[PDB]
Symmetry: C3
């Protein structure tokens, strides 16, 4: 299924009928960081498998629902069960849900992820407001937009200079200051490693030399599809570990350790993003 | 359709019949830089769609013709409607037209493109004679030659040390000096970004650290196919903007601005390449 | 054919019946470095084409056999006819033979390759014990593990911090010292260039800036599949040429020159690896 105007429209038509929610904000949550979705009010849970033209996710298994409802007085749509490119999903499969969000009315997409810290200032449990990226798949002919352009959504050659909205980064930082956790909050450049192997020690050392502050396996594809169709983005990485320090100390990177950091910060991140949602401009 | 000897031969047989032109030189022109093709003498226009085994281009649409005729006393073949890998064309689809050029008798391929400037010396409207490249798709398992080798055209492992012919670069510079526009002409290393998103500000900053002088979304695949089958190459980038300066000044990159630079330099580039063609050696 | 548990089991069942050899060690040899396979004792040669679910290799042609037998008192299985990703083999085709090795009982995989030297200390004919890697395909969404995870073999997100076993590197160096060829032996980081074009002069210069010591077109995919399923790895590069020096001197890289270096060091490498095999721990 191509992520075109007709196919995205058919999915949005189904969702509009079944949900009766017109969302202004979209959310995609990192692993272990999805509990805000469980707290959506007046919520409507729509399995991906029920939505016309949504990507098939049964090979990977696990949860796959679109959840619509109200958070902090705003109407939102959430992806419960993120699609990651290391699973083998195509460019079309990644793009269609974001384009459906656009047709549903989403103007702002909020994204969280778990990432490795490269910059020396970053400790496990820190947050990084993403201000730019290095898209290794994109440089390497695996950009999420490779393929025919879908003109109804955006231009053939998008500029990414404003992919990460500055005002949204400023609002996120302001809320952290108001709640006295700004000492945890940094800003930085995200390197997209296609994955699914963690960054090797020597890849981490290369990323250090190349300016990269954090590395992870997601986010950049969704950012690009959103930017292409005019959706503003705030993307926040939770630092699971400092990969440069771990390489210096012969310490392994491990998904169980990553998820334990997610559990440690999950409630703070939920509170933060709920307040961001309530504070977003009405326009 | 595989870009093999039999299939390329079938395309060349059709072209030889319909055109009656045996070209010595091939040309592939950047966007907005194609007007020389409109000035080919005694010309024969062959739609790609009519040529056996040529790639289907109707999804992208727009023009797709092979144009044969005379420029500056030399017999040439031009691609009117370049095939770009960000459109989703396969390695086989990119390679077949160049291999057809080889079977038609092409010994020299002239290429122009529009690119972003990384080196600080580069201003909008400058020309860069490409002297080498950094092929991010190639490093990343998306080299245009991935797949079975077609032994009749070239070796399994081509060396790229002489992919950009030195004598052709020297001739291009000499003609610029004779016409007093050598102040516009630089030389440099081309980074291939698969695209189609423009280089992000942080990707540009990385390319600066990595020695790259210019960045763009084309050219390297054609250079490699030509080098593989023994065709000499001259490749010239027209600098649309300096991406490092634009990132420092929060200035966007935009295809309309790119095309306006192409329009500003199109006539000078046509005159330059016409003279290069007339001055090429007969052997 | 997916490189899953059922399919790998069917291949291993066939091999166990026909060979009567239960191997503890696997070997994959670089081009021109395969003569140890010819010296396997009590050997059983099994054409890939006869093994259920093994990848089809007839388009590339050339030899394709699994060879089982005894070397230095240990039971081994060798791939005679390596599968390279620049040929177009899929992730599944690369992974299945290594996973078959795992089901056959392989605990240690020994790998050799031919590579370009980047580090200035490296001369043609030197050996590099690989201690880490920079996986450009992996960063670029072409990691050998992209696709559904096969849980029976390993985790979704492997850590590569111990992909190159330290004790095996130490044993290899110790044997070189005992035989007075330690002056040829270095250690270093391997950059994976998908290929099949040799590293361009400017790619080599970039790799120098990025810490890389050697560059080649293989090995990293097999290392990752082995690491994913718990097989320890020793990987050794034979330096065919110093690409930085060759770029400084306008000297070409050439497969015939590469193979001549392989021939010059083939007998020493066979003796070295035979002794490594005899000296490997029984556990
Ligand atoms: N160290 C890491 C943590 C989480 N995700 C990554 O890709 N890397
Ligand atoms: N800045 C740029 C201009 C043209 N092409 C590119 O890829 N980048
Ligand atoms: N210079 C090289 C020799 C062998 N293999 C490579 O990839 N490069």
């Amino acid at each position: 299924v191509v992520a075109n105007y007709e196919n995205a429209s058919m999915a949005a038509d189904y969702i509009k009928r079944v949900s009766n929610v017109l969302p202004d904000i979209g959310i995609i949550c990192g692993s272990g960081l999805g509990k805000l979705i469980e707290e959506i009010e007046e919520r409507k849970v729509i399995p991906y498998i029920n939505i016309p033209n949504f990507p098939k996710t049964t090979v990977a298994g696990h949860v796959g629902n679109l959840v619509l409802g109200s958070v902090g007085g705003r109407k939102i749509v959430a992806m419960q069960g993120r699609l990651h490119m290391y699973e083998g999903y195509s460019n079309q499969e990644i793009a269609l849900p974001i384009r459906v969000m656009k047709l549903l009315g989403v103007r702002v997409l909020l994204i969280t992820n778990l990432a490795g810290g490269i910059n020396r200032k970053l400790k496990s449990g820190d947050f990084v407001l993403i201000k730019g990226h290095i898209n290794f798949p994109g440089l390497g002919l695996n950009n999420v937009l490779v393929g025919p352009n879908q003109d109804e959504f955006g231009p053939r050659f998008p500029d990414l200079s404003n992919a990460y909205d500055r005002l949204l980064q400023q609002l996120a930082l302001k809320i952290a200051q108001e709640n006295d956790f700004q000492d945890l909050v940094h800003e930085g450049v995200y390197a997209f490693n296609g994955g699914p192997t963690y960054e090797s020690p020597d890849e981490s050392n290369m990323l250090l030399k190349l300016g990269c502050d954090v590395v992870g396996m997601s986010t950049v594809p969704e950012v690009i599809i959103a930017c292409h169709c005019g959706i503003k983005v705030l993307a926040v990485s939770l630092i699971a570990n400092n990969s440069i320090l771990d390489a210096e100390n012969d310490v392994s990177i491990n998904h169980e350790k990553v998820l334990a950091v997610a559990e440690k910060r999950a409630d703070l991140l939920q509170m933060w993003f709920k307040e961001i949602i309530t504070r977003l401009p009405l326009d």
